[PDB]
Homo-oligomer: A and B are copies of this chain.
């Protein structure tokens, strides 16, 4: 046996030049794709913004064209999904996770257009979903598209070009190269056996796409939270506690995301019409909320900075938390195209802040700043619901640049994952592949 190792060891880190070059193209495409998608959502959120101007006097009439603008845009997207690409509804990440096990198809000729224009409308109407959904799936697809179109062959190149698309796709959505890389190797990568996913390949794609995102979205953070205070050792136990809280709520939130998913299915029955109408309903409800209480609706990024600066009351926080648990589920469990990742960043931020707010009053002797707990909590729901702690932590790091909070973050996030396990819940992106797969089976 030993003699094969010595032949393997000496062959370690070799990635066929063909593959590498292709990842580069994959990356560049996904980047541009992602940037295009980003401009899209803006433009629409804008038209919407300036349509409430045309009707700025009649309060009842404006509440209307807010609802109908979101409703119409939402429907356009739910439809686009049910008609031409069922698999492109919801997140799409579990779908890409499947493709790595070779257990789901990558219908790129279908999904690319469907997901792109599909989300372009659910996000545009101001529903509570993130870009990661669309970009990661669009990412992998863009991945396979160039696999096919260059008739590249192999087990390596199929899983490797697919992964790097997914990474460059997450990278491009958060301006987070490392988060994109760690994402593959912690949530994606067929987690029960080793695969031929070349890390170096992924890297390249993530780079190329990050550079694309930068050619266009330079000079302004998604989240600018400033540089917060440090965290003294005698303060650490507090983050463990916060974690334990995220770790029990983690599962319960997964329960709901799935439950609510079921309970929503009945509404339409499966019927493309009752669906597209129920979509346009939630859709519209969002555009209504995005006007008369923006913190309850929308991606959630806007309220992150505000909440980390302790600029919300404890009331406004508990409100925003509930309103958002509600609009998040409604928007995602319902099957609209778009991620649940970002709205989870917002959820955890808000929760964490409230924790800090209390921590601050119970311990003046710790000289706390609630903001540090908001930052500890930002990737914490992601920790307990997705079981991607390493990924969340580095995502938040890349996005908020408060490295001093690394211990507090790791502790909240780990402590989150620990309790998500011992209270018995599952990787939400994985329990969703498992539903999907049990249904594709228990109908044959």
Contact = CB atoms under 8 A, between A and B. Distances in A.
Interface residues of A, number: 64
A438 B6 contact: yes
A12 B186 CA distance: 11
A35 interface: no
A411 B17 contact: no
A150 interface: no
Given A211-B407, A236-B211, A390 B9 contact: no
Interface in A146-203: 177-178, 181-182, 185-186, 191-194, 199-200, 203
Interface of A: 2-3, 5-6, 8-10, 12-15, 17, 20, 101, 103, 177-178, 181-182, 185-186, 191-194, 199-200, 203-204, 207, 210-211, 214-215, 218, 233, 236, 387, 389-390, 393-394, 397-398, 401, 403, 406-407, 410-411, 414, 417-418, 421-422, 426-427, 430-431, 433-434, 437-438, 441
Contacts of A433: 9
Q: From DSSP, what is the main secondary structure of chain A's interface residues? A: helix
B430 A9 contact: yes
B207 A410 contact: yes
B6 A418 contact: no
Contacts of A218: 233
30 contacts: A5-B101, A6-B434, A6-B438, A8-B192, A9-B433, A9-B434, A9-B437, A10-B431, A10-B434, A12-B191, A12-B426, A12-B430, A13-B426, A13-B427, A178-B390, A178-B406, A181-B390, A185-B185, A194-B194, A199-B390, A203-B390, A204-B414, A207-B414, A211-B236, A211-B407, A214-B407, A218-B233, A397-B403, A398-B403, A401-B403
